[PDB]
Design a protein around this nucleic acid. Structure first.
Ligand SMILES: [Mg+2]
Ligand SMILES: [Mg+2]
Ligand SMILES: [Mg+2]
Ligand SMILES: [Mg+2]
Lengths: 14, 94, 99, 105, 79, 98, 105, 86, 98
DNA sequence: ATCAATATCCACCTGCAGATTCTACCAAAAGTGTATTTGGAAACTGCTCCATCAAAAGGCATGTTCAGCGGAATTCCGCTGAACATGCCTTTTGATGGAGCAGTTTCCAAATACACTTTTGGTAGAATCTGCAGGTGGATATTGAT
DNA sequence: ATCAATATCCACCTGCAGATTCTACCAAAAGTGTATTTGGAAACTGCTCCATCAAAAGGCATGTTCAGCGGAATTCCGCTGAACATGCCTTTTGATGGAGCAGTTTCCAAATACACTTTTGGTAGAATCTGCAGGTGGATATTGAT
């Protein structure tokens, strides 16, 4: 289930 | 009788966006509430100190930002300042 | 024929075991007796919310568990594997609880 | 009628954060942007913890986040560990950790 | 004797969660003293919060506030 | 066109009054006075802050001498608190009698 | 005309302490007795340190208290020591203390 | 207006100076590896305090680090200092 | 020739520096280090003279206290020689290292 | 290496506490709008304190030599602490009434906030006083060799 | 033990940086009045907490045996302290330029106060759902004896 939260978490930025 | 306020419905909303198939026990939710109240006080207290140190009587988003920079470690501070600025920007355009 | 694990084996098994779980490790009622006893000296005829006693236990055990870790680091620092009172005392001193 | 949270793109209550800032006696006045900013920060950090905890739950083949998953999430992240270096998560337990000198030969 | 209700097996388990493998017999008595000091400090403050509120019941919040000022913040019982 | 330098107020003259009461032939260096000034400000913040928290925890909007007292009981160790509450109550009573 | 300090019997400024409680945003309102009480406590603690510092000065045949004397006063009193357990007094140095095992035989 | 280049200044924390600090701390015998470890620990200490202090400087829109900036930063780190303005 | 035994001058130095309060790092080298470190965070910074002195008072106070703790760790290991692992254990237990 | 005792792992099952969805009520909280008021940015500028320099001298850093004594390796014996079986008592659980006390609503006097003037104490800057830092000299306390 | 080399203690002297006393200005504290608000006293209610009992459950206290570990004794090589020669760079002092801090005036965007309407979050209470703890079975990894 992919994050549909619009905020860039640290894991997202990698 | 009197309403006991909580961040719980907001914590739940965020949970469904980041892990839409994951739930959270009430004990875990209580801990999340303690967490949000805690960080709230810490940042707000730090911003409070900031404004007093500078003889200002208003807490602006700038006080919050410096507060964040002081409290949050490395990368967390970076993304928090980023999201904080995003929200304020988005808010003003409306 | 009897079968006996060597000293340390169950100890390691227990470490793995209690490090995996989260349940409180002191019996509830003795702890509750101790809390009320200690409080009696501060104010008499006190009642305690059920959660208040639980909070005190969560905090006390979390505190003691961390203290045993530091205590363990002090024992090993002295090239021992056995924790001793001077190990607790050194940890508490450096933390600034004793001095 | 349209809430400030929606104006900023947030799930967290901007209006409530604003009201809590006024009541907390942090200063005489509160700028209109401060609660927007703070609510965003609070939401971001909530998302950060829920993400790592969800992963923690998933690793344990659980679909319900319990306090153990929150503990594992925070103590395994150097930066969250720091932020909560003086915080105790009830029913969280500790990270599995045996000093190597204590291991068998 | 209520401090002795904190039994040797119980103390041993806490130490096991702390990663401890071998335990000197003198540890248990030292531990109880340390626990008693811990509870005295926290409880005195909590009850001080209790009295100030003119209550006869120690609440979880009283304990949480007491822990926070002692620098041992607790999550899960109010915040 | 001259300008007035903003006054940095200090607890210094009050400390000196108290110094003269306890050791009438003793003086104090300016570095020692600065430290005393830091001390008084520090304890001020610590007590008031603790009292602030107290009132908020109890949904009161007023800091009364009662919040100061509980705060002192929370901050100061044993004996110091005992005598502090004494001086505090002594003073408040005296002030009211006028 | 009669100052609030004299009404309370205090050397420390009640009026100033009152004003500082207002500017510091500790609460909406501040009771008339709070600055009286707090000014008394601040004065008590001041007398307490100065008493002990004065002695330290006397022990060193000095009549002027320096920061070394404040340090000696505080670190030798178990309760001020605790009260100031996280405070650093500039130019205070430390207490003479040699661990006994380091001494000659 | 040629500002010069600062580098390797941590070595300005000399072995004799480190030895003196240890003496005030009541230390009698010192391993040769201590001096490098001490410089490392000191560097981390100064990085953390100066960063917070400068953060106070920037927020105040100043180009000069004041004693108060250092005092507030120390207070945040839980190392309150008396004698410089608090 | 006349020679004090190993440890004798060390104990004299302990008594000496425990008796005084002056800073023990040289003033100018410390100032260079502060400016070097500060420069890497942000360029074109100036320092009040007291700001640097405050940083020195704080740093030396910090380091002296750490050596006390370091000393206790060495002695705990039945040594009289302080070592890096002593500093490391101390900072770990203080919560600086973890 | 063989072999047995025991711990541990995994797939599957299911009864249920705890979680979730559904609905209604409402006080309170958030939004919207007009009216009013003030803080803090901007421009301007006076002034303090900071960066830098020059010059001279010695306090202190550096690098070396040389040997004492400390740390760490090794050995080993006594004893402490772990494992474990036995059997017994404390704790846990769940129900029940009992009720103490916390939380809610209303009420109203006292206390505080707010505003205008008068008064006075605290500050800064100038002149005047003095504790002690730094040096010298001489008696005595300590250390280490023999 | 005695004796020499060296550190340490203490008394005295004195020039001066730093402290204290002296003087004038103003911002802040005190006085007086009207307006506003809070928290407590009082009554009440539902909740949660204490006491009790009983029953099933299970953890703990105890005593014994032995392995493994802690500490003591011994040995020794290399490190780290004491002492010394050398010279450098820090400290001290006094000058200057000017960057930037800090004080003042003006002005408006932003904040607050007030009134009024809409929405939402928290509660409760009923019904319903469901993740997973606890248990079973059966395969194998771990540990320890021989
Ligand atoms: Mg007494
Ligand atoms: Mg005392
Ligand atoms: Mg650089
Ligand atoms: Mg050289």
């Amino acid at each position: 289930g992919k994050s549909t939260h619009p905020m860039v978490t640290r894991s997202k930025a990698d | 009788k009197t309403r006991k306020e909580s961040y719980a419905i907001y914590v739940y909303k965020v949970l469904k966006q980041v892990h839409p198939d994951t739930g959270i026990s009430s004990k875990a939710m209580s801990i999340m509430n303690s967490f949000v109240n805690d960080v709230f006080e810490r940042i707000a207290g730090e911003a409070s100190r900031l404004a007093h140190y500078n003889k200002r009587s208003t807490i602006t988003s700038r006080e919050i930002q410096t507060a964040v920079r002081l409290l949050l470690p490395g990368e967390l501070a970076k993304h928090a300042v980023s999201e904080g600025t995003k929200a304020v920007t988005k808010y003003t355009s409306a | 024929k009897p079968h006996r694990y060597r000293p340390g084996t169950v100890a390691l098994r227990e470490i793995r075991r209690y490090q995996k779980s989260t349940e409180l490790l002191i019996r509830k009622l003795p702890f509750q007796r101790l809390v009320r006893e200690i409080a009696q000296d501060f104010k008499t005829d006190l009642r305690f919310q059920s959660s208040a006693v639980m909070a005190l236990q969560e905090a006390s055990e979390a505190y003691l568990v961390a203290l045993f870790e530091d205590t363990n680091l002090c024992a090993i620092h002295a090239k021992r594997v056995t924790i001793m009172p001077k190990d607790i005392q050194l940890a508490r001193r450096i933390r600034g609880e004793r001095a | 009628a349209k809430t400030r949270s929606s104006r900023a793109g947030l799930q967290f209550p901007v209006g409530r954060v604003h009201r809590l800032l006024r009541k907390g006696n942090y200063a005489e006045r509160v700028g209109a942007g401060a609660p927007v900013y703070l609510a965003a920060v609070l939401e971001y950090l909530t998302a950060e913890i829920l993400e790592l905890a969800g992963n923690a739950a998933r690793d344990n083949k659980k679909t319900r986040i319990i306090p153990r998953h929150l503990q594992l999430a925070v103590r395994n992240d150097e930066e969250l560990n720091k932020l909560l270096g003086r915080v105790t998560i009830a029913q969280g337990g500790v990270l599995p950790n045996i000093q190597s000198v204590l291991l068998p030969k | 004797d209520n401090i002795q209700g904190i039994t040797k097996p119980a103390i041993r388990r806490l130490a096991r969660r702390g990663g401890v493998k071998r335990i000197s017999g003198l540890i248990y008595e030292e531990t109880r003293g340390v626990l008693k000091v811990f509870l005295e400090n926290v409880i005195r403050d909590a009850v001080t919060y209790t009295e100030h509120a003119k209550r006869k019941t120690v609440t979880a919040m009283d304990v949480v506030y007491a822990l926070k000022r002692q620098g041992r913040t607790l999550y899960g019982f109010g915040g």
